[PDB]
């Protein structure tokens, strides 16, 4: 069973930002036409070549070996912003150790005079701010006027980010991760905590209106190209980390045992965990909309702080809220820290496979972990400042889960389906597993996933809406250009590798292409 800060954090706010009900139709369309086949595809590439990352494509069409470098750039940017998520979770954890939680009431220093408590909001009869949103935007974020105003580096959040990078650095190497009975604890503790939030959320007054927001689709919103890419790349986001889950928690361990059915087990458990966490979150948001005087779609942040608003707000409606706040943010830290151990281990493994003996493995290699974590911390300092949410939402929308994931998935499916061969790949699959994949996987890699990714990419490129944080901020064109630069640094790995592999190999164009598309 796989779970991370995908299901728990990302899917609720991407669903809430895109109207709730209208998000689930592209979510399940991508889940059953793209996401499970692409997840099985990358798992078969991982099990096929007995190496890691970039050099997994020397046996699958070495012309397109830039998919490995695209995965390198995607996981690097993902590590930076996913660890600043963990910095926010740590900051909420250290603010959870007093008796009465700081987001429960608004009489503190960071609160505006316009606030009053959410319990006393329907007795006013309306431009009154909730205390959870005020705490989130003014003590955790200390949200500035825009990305043009980064303000000052929050030393609280920067030391929380340094603490969680020291936890990562002291566990990636010079240490060991969870192996034995602690695995059995950390496999069911996030599910138990999510079950506690779900049972709490459904019993809140007004959860039914939130579930009606969550499940009933708004069909006019399906014509928004933001919804389709948000859903499909939430699938590709939650499964690229699930790709690293199998690869980093055991390579070729599932060798004869059904890496088809293993992949559908973890994929369906991951998507079901997303769906359960969405039920919990939107039950809380329906409760908050009934409790306040505002709409369900306006009650909280249409942006990444939804899990830091709805889940702490539900924690404040528990018996002993300090207990549930401490354990919920410990759960967030365990989930994202295990996923960060997974992704940083994958990044180190793939870079020391990029240079097997070239200057990395022959030296100490302890210092390479420190340098990678150091520049990843310094890049994480750009989005943990006072304008840190704007840089963070840029990184989340663009750097590792935007059209870049559609680009990588379409290019993997196109290469394996056409330039490598569905039948050749199926023969390899039968060699490792024992049976060729069915017409679902075959026609998904051939037709369905390239058509879905190309259609969503072209559909947003013809019906473009800019990235907006919390429906009210409009990013400046330099910030949109920076986000597209992160996406293209993930995306332009493939064509630049195509060009340099054409120019390094001597011969005519047909001979170069023929040499580079035949596997080695």
């Amino acid at each position, epitope marked *: 069973g796989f779970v991370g800060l995908g299901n728990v954090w990302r899917f609720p706010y991407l669903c809430y930002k895109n109207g709730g009900g209208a998000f689930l139709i592209p979510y399940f369309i991508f889940l059953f036409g793209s996401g499970l086949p692409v997840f099985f595809l990358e798992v078969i590439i991982g099990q096929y070549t007995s190496e890691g990352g970039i050099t997994c494509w020397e046996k699958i069409c070495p012309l397109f070996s830039g998919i490995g470098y695209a995965s390198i750039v995607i996981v690097s940017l993902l590590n930076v912003y996913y660890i600043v998520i963990l910095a926010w979770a740590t900051y909420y954890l250290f603010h959870s150790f007093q008796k009465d939680l700081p987001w429960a009431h608004c009489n503190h220093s960071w609160n505006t005079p316009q606030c009053m408590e959410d319990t006393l909001r329907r007795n006013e009869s309306a431009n009154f701010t909730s205390p959870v949103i005020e705490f989130w935007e003014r003590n955790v974020l200390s949200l500035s006027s825009g990305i043009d105003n980064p303000g000052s580096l929050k030393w609280d959040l920067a030391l929380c980010l340094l603490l969680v990078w020291l936890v990562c650095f002291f566990c990636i190497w010079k240490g060991v991760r969870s192996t034995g009975k602690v695995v059995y604890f950390t496999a069911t503790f996030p599910f138990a905590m999510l079950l506690v939030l779900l049972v709490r959320g459904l019993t809140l007054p007004g959860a039914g209106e939130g579930i009606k927001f969550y499940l009933y689709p708004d069909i006019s919103r399906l014509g928004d190209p933001q919804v389709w890419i948000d859903a499909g790349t939430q699938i590709f986001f939650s499964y690229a980390i699930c790709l690293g889950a199998m690869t980093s928690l055991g390579s070729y361990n599932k060798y004869k045992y059904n890496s088809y059915r293993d992949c559908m087990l973890l994929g369906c458990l991951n998507s079901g965990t997303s769906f359960v966490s969405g039920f919990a979150i939107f039950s809380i948001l329906g409760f908050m909309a009934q409790e306040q005087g505002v709409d369900i779609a306006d009650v909280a942040e249409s942006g990444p702080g939804l899990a830091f608003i709805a889940y702490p707000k539900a924690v404040t409606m528990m018996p002993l809220p300090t207990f549930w706040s401490i354990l919920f943010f410990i759960m967030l830290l365990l989930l994202g820290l295990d996923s960060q151990f997974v992704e940083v281990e994958g990044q180190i493994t793939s870079l020391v496979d990029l240079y097997p003996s070239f200057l990395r493995k022959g030296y100490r290699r302890e210092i390479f972990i420190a340098i990678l974590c150091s520049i990843s911390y310094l890049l994480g300092l750009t989005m943990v400042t006072e304008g840190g949410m704007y840089v963070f939402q840029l990184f989340d929308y663009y750097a590792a889960s935007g059209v870049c994931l559609l680009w990588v998935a379409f290019f993997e499916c196109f290469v394996i389906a056409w330039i490598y061969g569905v039948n050749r790949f199926s*023969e390899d699959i*039968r*060699d490792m597993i*024992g*049976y*060729r994949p069915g017409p679902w996987m075959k026609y998904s890699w051939a037709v369905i996933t390239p058509a879905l990714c190309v259609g969503c990419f072209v559909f947003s490129l013809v019906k473009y809406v800019p990235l907006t944080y919390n429906k009210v901020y409009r990013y400046p064109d330099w910030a949109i250009g920076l986000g597209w630069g992160l996406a293209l640094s993930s995306m332009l790995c493939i064509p630049l590798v195509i060009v340099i592999l054409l120019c390094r190999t001597e011969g005519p164009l047909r001979v170069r292409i023929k040499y580079l598309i035949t596997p080695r």
Partner: antibody
Amino acid sequence: EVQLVESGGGLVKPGGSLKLSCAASGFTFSSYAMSWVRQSPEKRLEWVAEISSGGRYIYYSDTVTGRFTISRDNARNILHLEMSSLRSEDTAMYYCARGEVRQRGFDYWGQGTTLTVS
Amino acid sequence: ENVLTQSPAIMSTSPGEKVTMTCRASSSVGSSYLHWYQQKSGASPKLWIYSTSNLASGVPARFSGSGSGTSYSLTISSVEAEDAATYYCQQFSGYPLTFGSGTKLEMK
């Protein structure tokens, strides 16, 4: 109806060679891996050689690893088995078997060709 | 090789009697890869039970299979005159694919 017909079996000298030909029809031959299973006159079954769906993954048993070669012609839907250095403990009744899914076994077999070494 | 020592070949059982036959493997088979074949007198083998429990097409429900790992069993609920044949158990996981020995069911 899936049918597998084997041919090219007969008496050969020891240390010689003979070419079997499993001809199959009624199904697509490029999508199913194929194996050769022999049966001794003492009536024990021994798997000889499996070729994959495209011929890129070829396996042999420990008895005939270095002297038996199995080949497929996808175009003519025929499965072959080139032999070499046929020793005395190789007289058998050679069957062609459609083994593609590893969890469903050899679901369709064929007739036999009596390879006789004397 | 993964030598599958099977039950002794000469078993003689009266019709209508519940019978069983074992298939011990030297290595460990993954229990989705061990199959049973029924070869009649002078005829070709045919797939009879696959993945140690499932029934092949044209096989009556009176046949059943059980076991996992090392010990695998074929069970007939009641024997009729069309059940007089030799049964071979066969792992198909490890790349030197091996069949079992004989288990020839003769009448009385």
